[PDB]
């Protein structure tokens, strides 16, 4: 058996669709389905605050009492009594009357607290006050109108305390904020607080606190929205990136946002892509591009890379994609033997292969460079993959080899499994270049060489179950992609099937049902040479 | 005995066959009777295999212009016949009733052919029955016409089952039946039609005429004409369209329904007056009264038949034509039968062909 | 901020201001260079003012002030957030200039009764005969009806009679036949039975012949049907094939037209396009920077560890030190009780550990002071970025010139 | 003279109707007569058949008379056999005829299937056409690939020099990047200083504990004798002397760095005050400009 | 038995709410099982699902940060084994031949994909294969538009009745098949 060149089945995915598809009936107007929906002053002051909170005369009388009580309180220089009793009366005051009534209290609070550190001793009281505000106040714009809150913030010093306030404030904001819109002032204040949080961060702070804080930030972030203003949105993002360096996941959100903006902009333009559209496109591209390096989560960064890729594919940026691929490639060696997630170490190779899998498909979707060697990139990636220190259970390598042949098969196709928009691929140029086809086949054969080598090595290795599965796949693939009109390859497929059976660690049930499937497929007319195979395939069995 | 076998071996005018080949088509394949190419086309129209599986009813029996015909289809079951045969439909043609005995001799013929493939040996069996009214089989225990008197074929019908199914619809059926009136039966299952309809000559059978049983009539003009040759008639059908036609039918039975239909004048001639109440009573008992089997029910219907015949009998004179009587129907009305009994007497004297005009 | 220096290049290119050779930094500039840029900036962006002041450099110093005041106004065109004016417009720190420049770059007894009777009589005479004729006609019609029925009746009886006659003929013939057979009944019976059975054998013969004749006909039929279908399928397939290939070829020609015309567009585009420094170059630069970030971040990260372990080492040391001194000082005092000079050694114990604390503290202080040094040096950097002394020299000579100028102006006010 | 036209008119109508109806009578009567003869004829024929039938009946009675002379069983068997042979002759002869008949029929049917066939040349020419289409399609695909090559070349050429718009994001990135550069690196080296600090703290913790334990034991040994105890007093004064020398070296460093710090800080403050002077002098000049322009207003009004 | 199957919600980045009438169609409780092929992305989206019905299963797609979701699962309802994948595992995305390869690996009667981004529902080899599409209509990079689509099916022993929901503005279109276990 020489280096017998693989040659492929030909398939009309459209005809295959029409055969395999079930045609569902469009269901009738309003028809059934299972979920069709067919004695000091302050002491009495506070005591009175309790009684009034419980029971009170009419609002006008409450107002009178407010004036009298708070006036005396302003006269009351003693800050501790002042803060203690005011905290109780505040709830009742905000409960009945509008903002300004309390705003007076705010002013006098600022006055009494300002001259002396004791307000820092009163930090809890300040917190409870704001929490009470939270319960009673819910529309942001009024708080912005209730500008006293800014002096309130300014009064503080203790970063931590402030941060606590921020957490509470923003969670309440989230509970209230359900409107995806904008207000520059609203943004300004929020952003200021956000930076307060961000700068509060240090390298030393607990990652969990970091995470939660970030996540909250992230929530409002999702809420941030100015509708149809790609450039404003963009810029805001840029600076956001600038400041909010303190946690990457957060930044990924921005990344995602970029993507969303870009893609939707693309869709609404409907191919009617002006200079503006394409520049905007490229800018999203870059911003994103530059981001990943800044990032850390390599695996994540990789899928991010491929998204970057595909959007560039969506956006006509070939060599750009190439760069990203080079990057992915560069990350490939980076992938360590074990990676830690959830605090725990897991065999990454499984995961990276999963990526690789979707990437490979992604491969053929690319239009290549004429200058660059026709899919050289592909080989580089695979070769490097093999260069990784794969231990035993390399067989996953072999899985990829298999699948790579499936890809090679698509390249072999004079027409590809899908064709995307304006996207071009070597098919779209070459229309079945015999030369390209042959070179591809040669590449396949290279893989097939590796296939034979390791499989029989595994035979030397008594890895009869794993090797057996590998042969299982090999024959399966040959079936999907091949023509037994290479009688030689058909026979080698028999060699496989019985070789697997002669070592015998394979599931004989698998093999039996497999053979049954072989005959069931073989039944079709072209499959008569598969019928020749399936009968010419007897089967040695554990049974 | 033997005279009946010689008659029957005239009547059994021979075998039909149709099949299908692998080139793509169902086909007639040769066999052994006195052919009639027109009637041959008619039988082809009988052929269930003509629709490869509309309902590939595996057996049919039939009668045409008093000539009976008998049919088997098994597509192709496991046998050593020529594998070109994709489908098969064996038939015979007759003037005689023993569908079961035909089923036997045919099963003999068929299995013999299923071993050999040759129809000519099976024709040897045709010849054997021809010569003897009997056949041995290599494939089977032997068959004798002595095995299966026609009255055995007549016993097979359960009248109880039908009358328990049809109640006063059976009073409709009765009043059409006795008076020589045009009876239609519809069920899409030819098997059920065959069973029910062949039971229908059993009803009143002592008033013997078995030739009536044309178990498969087509709506073709020639076939409808042939049924027109009949007057008291029962023809079987598997589609509703015959219900359209009380002009054509005195009764439409949907056996798919368990329903029986009254023709326009029959709505008086079969109106529930005195005799038809008597019949309502008798048929309620024929469901309900257990004492008497189907043939015994025929005996008690023969009691009613002798009642009506003897009502006619002294009131009627026996003509110079000798065979039959001429009825003073005016004197029968002077008897003053309550109106439905007197009407049934008149209509049966028509059915007896014993009128005076 | 050399990347920003590349933005300078960018800004110069967009403005159409040159990049003279050493004009690679803000450091190079004179005020005119910038303020010219500002002229370009609004003259692009707000020409209404921006047309106002030529890129021609002024020399009326008052015009320098006032044109510069127009620059402040140009900021007032939107309000770049910082302070404005000729003071700035004289030669500020490069950060400031850079920032503002960026702000710019972005937005880019009467006769009848006697005789009439005899006349109408003529009607009546015919009317009666008419009715009588009609009577006779109806009569004959009835006769024809009855006779036709009777005729058909006779026809029916004739048909049945014929039937009976035929039956009699057959029965009579058979009876004669039986009479013919009467003399040799047994022998005739056996002979005839044998004859019948042989004739049936002869029938069997013909059935075999006719069978065997029959089979070839069917086999040929089958053959012709099979070739019929094969032809029909074949034709259908070639037809479908060529339909599809034609349609695809059509689409390919359409695309060829589109491609060719676009290609010439691309020719025009090649004609148009500039040849600047590439996307790649900045890509590389960024990545370099990226690496920088990674490396020093990672170095900080090692340092994070180093701190962690170093402190826990110090912790262990502190515990061992405290317990060490407790045990040691206890024993030393126990010994000191013996003798005044042992007490002197104990004195040296306490004083030594004190001096240890002293030195440690001094080291701490040194660290703090050197942190101060960092701060001060940063501030120095700040002020030299303020070009601070040179800007002294600038404002001294400027204010000198303008004080002198204003004194001349006062003189002219009094003179003129 | 009393006379009517209706007499005339309807008289003529009546004569026409009489005559016409009478002729209808004559024809109908003739038909009656013809059918009468016809019917009577049928009757005669019927009588004729009856008479012949009666002769047949006479003949049957006589033939039955002859038959009576022997065993009816034997006669019946013979008759049956006669009918049997008769039937055999009939179906066999008929069947011969049908053999020939059906042979001819199939012969004719096959003659149909032959003349039906006695698309292929079409199929060949279709193959040729098909091949031609594929062939020009391949050459077309050649042009596609080539044009596409140009497409990619020109695209890359466009894009290699990104849009000023693109540069926008570029530089702001750079800007944060510088910010980071600085922030990070300064953080970094300051924490390196922190390292120096904790490093030195650990070093002297170690040296302190070690010397402490050593001197503790040397005390324990020395105190045993007054002479060695006093020797420990002197040697420890020497050790504390070296320690104090380390203290004094650190203090000297403190003072030197303090001097540097003082000098630079003072220069800093000098420069601060001077920078304030320069902004003041900035204001002074702007005052000089305001004065200048006021004087200019005066000067232009006065002199001009 | 009422069971809900979904994939590739892309909630935070692409699809931070489900649309109105589709949400509305999610009545809680009249669903027995919930199966997600992945890229629903968030634990809180899963919370919304688990509150839609408790019997949730999720296989790991791309963006689902809970890597602890299995790559695949064989779920079983009625009389059918039912294979679960994020089609990011599917070699030529969508190859029927590969799909049967999967079936023969796992001997399952049904399979559901999600990563593929057409509406897909092929049964051939007497084995059935599904793409609901993204029920949030998360953009298909290969494609110009996808309406969000989702299916519930009446799985009844050896038989399954499909309900193929499509939201078209206020138009919730639905299609039915019955799949069976011959």
Residue numbers in the entry:
A (entry chain O): 1 to 38, 459 to 963
B (entry chain M): 1 to 357
C (entry chain L): 1 to 108, 320 to 627
D (entry chain K): 309 to 426, 446 to 631
E (entry chain N): 1 to 182
Show sentences the authors wrote.
The Commander complex, a 16-protein assembly, plays multiple roles in cell homeostasis, cell cycle and immune response. The recently discovered multiprotein Commander complex is a master regulator of cellular homeostasis within endosomal transport and the trans-Golgi network.
The NN–CH domain of CCDC22 is wedged between the C-terminal V-coil of CCDC93/22. In the complete model, the Cα–Cα distance between the last residue of the CCDC22 NN–CH and the first residue of α8 is 23 Å, a distance that accommodates the 12 residues in the linker between them. This is the only covalent link on this side of the complex between the top and bottom halves, which highlights the importance of the binding interface between the CCDC22 NN–CH and the V-coil in terms of flexibility of the bottom half. The I- and R-coils are oriented at a 62° angle with the N-terminal side of R-coil harboring the binding site for DENND10. The binding site is composed of two interaction surfaces, with a hydrophobic groove between the CCDC93/22 coil and the corresponding hydrophobic patch on the NTD (or lobe) of DENND10 comprising the main site, and another mediated by electrostatic interactions via Glu19, Asp21, Glu25 and Arg40 of DENND10. The inherent flexibility of this region, however, may enable binding of Rabs in another conformation. Although the binding site identified in the homologous DENND1B with Rab35 is blocked in our consensus structure, the flexibility exhibited by the C-terminal half of DENND10 may expose this binding site.
